[PDB]
Amino acid sequence: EWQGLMQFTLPVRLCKEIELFHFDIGPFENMWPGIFVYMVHRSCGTSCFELEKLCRFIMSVKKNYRRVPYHNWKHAVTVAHCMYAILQNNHTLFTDLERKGLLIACLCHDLDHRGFSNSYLQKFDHPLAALYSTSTMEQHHFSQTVSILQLEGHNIFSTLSSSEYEQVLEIIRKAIIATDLALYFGNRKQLEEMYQTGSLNLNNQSHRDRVIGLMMTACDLCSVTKLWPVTKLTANDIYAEFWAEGDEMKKLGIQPIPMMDRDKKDEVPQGQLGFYNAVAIPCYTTLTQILPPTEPLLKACRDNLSQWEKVIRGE
Numbered sequence: 280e281w282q283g284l285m286q287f288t289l290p291v292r293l294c295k296e297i298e299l300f301h302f303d304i305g306p307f308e309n310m311w312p313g314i315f316v317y318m319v320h321r322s323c324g325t326s327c328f329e330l331e332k333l334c335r336f337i338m339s340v341k342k343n344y345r346r347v348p349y350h351n352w353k354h355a356v357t358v359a360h361c362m363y364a365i366l367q368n369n370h371t372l373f374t375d376l377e378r379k380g381l382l383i384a385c386l387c388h389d390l391d392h393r394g395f396s397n398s399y400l401q402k403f404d405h406p407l408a409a410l411y412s413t414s415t416m417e418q419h420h421f422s423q424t425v426s427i428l429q430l431e432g433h434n435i436f437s438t439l440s441s442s443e444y445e446q447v448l449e450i451i452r453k454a455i456i457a458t459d460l461a462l463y464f465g466n467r468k469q470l471e472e473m474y475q476t477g478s479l480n481l482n483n484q485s486h487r488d489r490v491i492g493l494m495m496t497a498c499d500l501c502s503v504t505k506l507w508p509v510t511k512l513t514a515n516d517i518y519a520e521f522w523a524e525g526d527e528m529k530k531l532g533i534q535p536i537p538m539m540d541r542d543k544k545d546e547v548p549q550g551q552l553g554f555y556n557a558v559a560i561p562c563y564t565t566l567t568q569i570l571p572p573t574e575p576l577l578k579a580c581r582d583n584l585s586q587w588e589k590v591i592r593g594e
């Protein structure tokens with residue numbers, strides 16, 4: 280498996296399209312791992328990692344994604360691609376070590392996701408909720424990454440110094456924890472505060488960490504920044520999984536919130552519009568303000584929002 284991956288070269292007809300924010304990995308399933316290789320080479324250099332160790336890592340990450348409807352291997356690569364495009368349009372603002380870490384983090388941010396929310400696992404007293412009280416799945420996701428890195432021939436940061444190793448693990452740690460949507464609101468409120476007061480300093484490490492946190496959220500939800508046909512199909516995958524979580528509550532004899540209730544299928548468009556306005560728009564809006572080149576994401580988000588309006592209005 281990892282043998283054929285090293286030989287892979289990306290089709291030339293996709294060299295300029297892959298750089299676009301709205302790029303859809305959808306119809307390139309068996310190219311996905313090589314696409315991640317491509318992106319890492321272009322953003323961090325070809326002589327950044329040993330190819331063998333990197334390919335072993337990608338393949339092990341792949342297999343440790345469960346066959347769930349949304350939080351699966353495809354989602355990982357999609358989030359990784361969004362991050363790539365962000366980093367490519369903001370060349371100088373991020374260090375070499377941050378580029379390596381963030382792309383790895385995006386690929387690993389949902390490792391061994393069971394298809395259940397933190398809310399579900401905490402309610403029903405899951406061993407993972409017993410272990411990690413808050414940001415349950417996210418701490419597991421990172422745990423999983425560490426385990427994979429500590430496998431033989433999988434340590435892709437082996438060439439980095441002892442000091443550089445513990446720095447990139449912290450960058451990875453924070454980026455993955457930040458993908459907990461519950462933490463997003465506080466983060467974005469703080470970043471908006473700093474912008475309008477003009478107290479935002481990118482020399483400030485804790486300010487850097489916050490900006491990165493927002494980038495993680497923006498990449499995580501980047502399905503809303505694709506073209507309407509792609510976005511609509513991704514919406515189907517999210518709800519299929521949400522509804523599967525809903526069914527598991529019904530089997531336990533407990534009625535789930537309408538978001539996860541499949542009998543509330545009609546209220547999906549209204550739920551979507553609400554989500555775009557409350558969560559998606561402010562996200563990409565604040566990100567655009569901090570990183571102006573990321574504007575095509577906001578533009579793309581506005582487009583889809585208006586499409587859900589047409590749905591609600593029946594057009």
Ligand SMILES: Cn1ccc2ncnc(Oc3ccc(Nc4nc5ccccc5[nH]4)cc3)c21
Nearest residue numbers: 499500502503517537538543546547550551554
């Ligand atoms: C996580 N995620 C990543 C990308 C992405 N794209 C779209 N939706 C996402 O997640 C949701 C899904 C649903 C809701 N709300 C909701 N309210 C409802 C009320 C009734 C019925 C369904 C309802 N659904 C909010 C967020 C996405």
Ligand SMILES: [Mg+2]
Nearest residue numbers: 388389416458
């Ligand atoms: Mg997650």
Ligand SMILES: [Zn+2]
Nearest residue numbers: 388389458499
């Ligand atoms: Zn995710």
